[PDB]
Design a protein around this nucleic acid. Sequence first.
DNA 1: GCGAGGTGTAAATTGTCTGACATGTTCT
DNA 2: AGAACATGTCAGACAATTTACACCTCGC
Lengths: 115, 116
Amino acid sequence: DARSDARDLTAFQKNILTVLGEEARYGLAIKRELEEYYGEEVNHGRLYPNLDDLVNKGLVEKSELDKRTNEYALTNEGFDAVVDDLEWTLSKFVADADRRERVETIVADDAAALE
Amino acid sequence: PDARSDARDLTAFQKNILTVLGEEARYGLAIKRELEEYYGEEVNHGRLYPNLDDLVNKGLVEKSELDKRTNEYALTNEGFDAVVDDLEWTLSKFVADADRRERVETIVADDAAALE
DNA sequence: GCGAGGTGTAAATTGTCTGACATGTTCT
DNA sequence: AGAACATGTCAGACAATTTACACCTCGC
Ligand SMILES: [Mn+2]
Ligand SMILES: [Mn+2]
Ligand SMILES: [Mn+2]
Ligand SMILES: [Mn+2]
Ligand SMILES: [Mn+2]
Ligand SMILES: [Mn+2]
Ligand SMILES: [Mn+2]
Ligand SMILES: [Mn+2]
């Protein structure tokens, strides 16, 4: 199930999954993205173990780009985890019509920004 | 006070509490129960209440007294901004193309349908 | 070759929960 | 009063990161 995976994870690793749901990336690129989110330096000694653990849970694929660089991407299971937490979040945020119109505005602005 | 400064370091558990309260304010054990539905297993109240207290001191949750054994927890304005800021983050990374988006659109549509 | 890029890794510190015991309250 | 309801609290146990050192690789 997507849920039994999406629960459990630490905030740090669900943020890793969100980042990878935008695009597959190599390790230090994930690192910089998380530094922009947290507004703090992110220790690589924290990130690599956590990507490793997301791999043994089958939510992240670790392929080789260089002999010094790895690319990390979402497996179909990690994607289902992302979607499941997004569904839970929206299920509880869209509690009335103004909440829906708010989400619709966010999504429409995002879409427009894809340009 | 920016919720981004206070809510991006929260634990997953605390974020889920904010999510639950985003739907509507609830008393303690009602939060416990809805969390238990999300997690599929029991949530120890000795874990819940101290994290509600931490969210309260961070200015994201308000603790009122319904009766003198029961407390009602509810988002402050900053707690609502924390929920919205996290949702905007998740979305800005998820809405990567037209199909990801229409997926979100149908999710929201079904949610609005459940409210009738 | 040399420096910078990319990742691996773990002991000690720090962060958090578990698994309780516990006190007042509302109900019948 | 008896019993479930609601929350308070925390020490022992567990989960996590910090802060280093470390090894190989690509770029110039
Ligand atoms: Mn940075
Ligand atoms: Mn680093
Ligand atoms: Mn829209
Ligand atoms: Mn976060
Ligand atoms: Mn917590
Ligand atoms: Mn309990
Ligand atoms: Mn945010
Ligand atoms: Mn936005």
